[PDB]
Design a protein around this ligand. Structure first.
Ligand code: A1H5I
Ligand code: A1H5I
Ligand code: A1H5I
Ligand code: A1H5I
Lengths: 213, 216, 212, 215
């Protein structure tokens, strides 16, 4: 009941704000987080429902899902924790991700930020395996957020009501595609949709399998 | 110059409070900090060790006995101005810790003795043994995230309960810590740091002043 | 399954030898390792009571207080295929990592036992760090005691593996992880040892400890 | 003693290495080259930059243009004696990497440009942007385990196939690396290292010699 195949598993996804107010003061706030698999079957969602929320030209979600394998494709619903004081104090907006496999491969992680189903920015990162605790580990550590995403978070936090933030987020999505660079095989695909958390616990997520009917 | 000989050099001393308010919220506050930095600077100022003998434990294993055995160039006075500007969230997922790092050209087994003293009498001692790790062309001795004893956690709580820094400084006049790093095999004193404390009133946060201890 | 409960789970256990031959050369050899399928096999705890101490705070007393689902037998096949070139820049160490949903002060007791009698105890207190959505307890590089370093040397001096296995019949390690505040047993690992003859190196088999 | 640094940025670590995992119980790490953290003392020995212009790319964005813009105190020649005494095992989960660390009193976005040059012509460029971490009372810029490009992995293999170090040294006469660390916001050159290579005369050691570049 996690984001993974037999070939690759998501261990960590963390989007955060670090703030160093002074030499004695450090703070780290998590906006969204997914942790490592821990021992019912995963709920399914028809991919046709999200076709308009992602690009559908050459290399689009429909084309990618068509090539398969279908068991690599997940819908991730995020509730973002925006309860943080953005000070004046060096700020760093970052994303940390970790994957694990039994196999050693060169993996390419494609991150596409999408507004009304149109690509606004793509970030491409290549990662090589590291043998830790009896498995091959792939870590993108402290990937800096683009100015688009920093500005977007600022604009959302300016809205006085969470229903207004959720309304804006209806047209905001992120597509994460992890590919074996050598074979061009899709290892993992995460279609990400966003709301703001109202919970005291903070950031939440719900994972679904993507299928056709 | 720095807290260091040809045999051992202090790289880092950091006393801190970590607080995890919730799964999305982490904070780390430094109370005191020393780092080693490449000098641009004069030799370290001297203090007569006779002036501080009453502020530390004496008789067998005491500062006078340790300084007598030498070497004298291993002995330093450290004046700390502690940053107490932090919100203790009722110790909700709180960790009080000390990180220290030393470096040497030699591979040694080092023993770090910490004696907390009230009016010149030992109130608690902590002893830690460290083994070298060869990192970046030097032997490194790292105590990572050593937990503070309950005496020190309670003491910090009591100080922060005082409404004025002048009241905290009055209490701290009679509070000292003696740090002794020893070669466990030869029993040679590598470094000795006699530590005295005030609270910082600076905007920048924690401050420190290092002196050599001499006899004259 | 794995070594864990709802309250605490073993993530990593490694016993190793590091050697720094020169400034450009570093080597690390693992003797034994555990990293986190049908349900785990059961073993009757009565079979192993004589292999561990049974006075006040002993295995029978600990198992009696429970919970029983915290108690495991770990059979290790140790990889002794390593050139102890010298103790020349050599470090013998143990790394362990545990995870829990709860924030606790955990006490890790390690008892080395010869013919069911304690020869050395190491007690290590660990405080949580919240990493990747869980509380993590890491003993990062715990130095081996001289007893264990000398024991490994003496075993490797024997010309045949059957002789090493014979000596190891009367050697055990008891690992007890306790909530320091409540004194609840979180995990107990009763460890028994053979030498590996496998090309793959170190192996292990985990069992639940039960009464019948 | 000798240190690659200015008042604005100082090299703490440069390490090029090979990690090998022979089996689940066996790990090895070999350093090819290493520069450590180092601190009155006299000036560094000088080299006329005109002598090395042919050994690095020139015209627009070139070493002459970079040195012209300055500051001159940011420019260093680094002679490396590489340790190639290592057993490259057959497909044994190998990782070829470079680890670098810089420190500053100032908080900056720094861009590290690495240009591998054969006969003074760029064969590969790697660009890495690093953001500061405030650690032990300073801003630290760490590129941890940057993977070596196939060109460099293949080059190390081909050199090690030669039966004599003097033959490797002959090949290395036309091999250089240019490291340029830039303040991304202001486009100021913080540090420039013009790197030349020999194989070490030692059985098991790596060495280096640092020089100032002058006109
Ligand atoms: C340039 C691309 C980039 O900076 N990204 C894309 C990857 C990524 C994924 C998740 C997050 O985290 C958030 C945080 C807050 C919200 C908000 F505003 F509440 F909806 C998010 F949608 C996503 C950042 C990035 C950064
Ligand atoms: C059991 C010993 C222990 O926990 N120690 C001794 C070593 C040590 C050194 C320094 C600090 O940091 C502080 C922080 C604040 C004050 C205060 F409050 F100003 F007095 C200090 F005196 C010392 C902690 C320890 C912890
Ligand atoms: C002082 C205690 C100590 O040093 N320990 C106890 C914990 C521990 C657990 C496992 C190992 O690893 C080995 C390695 C080899 C053998 C051998 F030789 F096969 F018997 C073992 F039994 C255990 C070391 C320690 C170290
Ligand atoms: C794609 C660029 C790359 O992978 N690089 C360039 C940066 C770098 C710097 C130094 C080293 O280390 C060596 C090791 C050995 C030799 C040799 F062959 F002996 F001369 C070197 F020249 C350089 C690697 C890189 C990797």
């Amino acid at each position: 009941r996690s984001i993974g195949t037999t070939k690759l598993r998501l261990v960590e996804f963390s989007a955060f704000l670090e703030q160093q107010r002074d030499p004695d003061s450090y703070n780290k706030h998590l906006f969204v987080h997914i942790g490592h698999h821990c021992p019912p079957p995963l709920e399914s969602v028809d991919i046709r429902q999200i076709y308009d929320k992602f690009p559908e030209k050459k290399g689009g979600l429909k084309e990618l899902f068509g090539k398969g394998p279908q068991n690599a494709f997940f819908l991730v619903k995020f509730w973002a924790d925006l309860n943080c004081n953005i000070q004046d104090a060096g700020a760093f907006y970052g994303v940390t991700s970790q994957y694990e496999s039994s196999e050693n491969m060169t993996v390419t992680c494609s991150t596409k930020v999408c507004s009304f189903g149109k690509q606004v920015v793509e970030k491409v990162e290549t990662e090589y395996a590291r043998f830790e605790n009896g498995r091959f580990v792939y870590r993108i550590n402290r990937s800096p957020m683009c100015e688009y995403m920093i500005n977007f978070i600022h604009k959302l936090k300016h809205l006085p009501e969470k229903y207004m933030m959720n309304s804006v987020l209806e047209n905001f999505t992120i597509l994460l595609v992890v590919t074996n660079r050598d074979t061009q095989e899709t290892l993992l695909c995460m279609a990400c949709v966003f709301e703001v958390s109202n919970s005291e616990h903070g950031a939440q997520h719900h994972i679904y399998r993507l299928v056709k009917d």
